[PDB]
Amino acid sequence: PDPVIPDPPIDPPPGTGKYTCPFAIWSLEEVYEPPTKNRPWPIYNAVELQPREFDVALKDLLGNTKWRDWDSRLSYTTFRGCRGNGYIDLDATYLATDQAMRDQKYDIREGKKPGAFGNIERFIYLKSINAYCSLSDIAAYHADGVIVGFWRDPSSGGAIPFDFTKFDKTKCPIQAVIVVPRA
């Protein structure tokens, strides 16, 4: 008996403009400290890059549907909604956890910044611009940063889970990191 034909994936809509990543972006390639038994990932030295643009307009990602707002960072005031129809925000707080680092359902690197205190932060990889962005920066008090992905998995009728641990970069690749406008 033939194998079952899988349902085809869902593709993101095209972008209608460009949008510069509104937080600092970085290259993490040089190793600062090798993995240890308790920390099975290296720490990199973070090197700053000049700003880059995603190939979507901010308005492409915005609309009138609700953000998941997993970590409640957007709950304190009225924001422009999400475009929805497959676009959705990811949990920037979860992605900075040891758990998210162990799993690498998304590619996340730990790195040491330049500067007085030499802060060690977790950096989400952004394939769209092949560069890294600090989860610390995106989720800072009043930054109003959102990581926007697009749900591609046609399973369960294409429904987006209400459990962020069900997400991964193949099911839901990152499309952009934005500052969501107030409304």
Curated annotation (Swiss-Prot):
Altering residue 36 to A: what's the impact? In strain: QB_3, Qbeta_3_FR
- What domain of life does the UniProt record list for this protein's source? Viruses
What is the recorded name of this protein? Minor capsid protein A1
Q: Enumerate the UniProt keywords alphabetically.
A: Capsid protein, Virion
Q: Which function does this protein serve?
A: Minor capsid protein.
Query: Is the keyword Endoplasmic reticulum in the record?
Result: no
Query: What GO CC terms are in its UniProt record?
Result: viral capsid
Q: Does the keyword S-adenosyl-L-methionine apply?
A: no
Q: What is the lineage of its organism?
A: Viruses, Riboviria, Orthornavirae, Lenarviricota, Leviviricetes
Shown portion of the complete protein runs from: 147 to 329 of 329
Q: Which GO terms describe its molecular function?
A: structural molecule activity
Q: Which effect does the record note for changing residue 146 to M?
A: In strain: Qbeta_1_FR and Qbeta_3_FR
Note in the entry: This protein is translated as a fusion protein by episodic readthrough of the termination codon at the end of the capsid protein.
Q: From the Swiss-Prot or TrEMBL record, state where the protein is found.
A: Virion
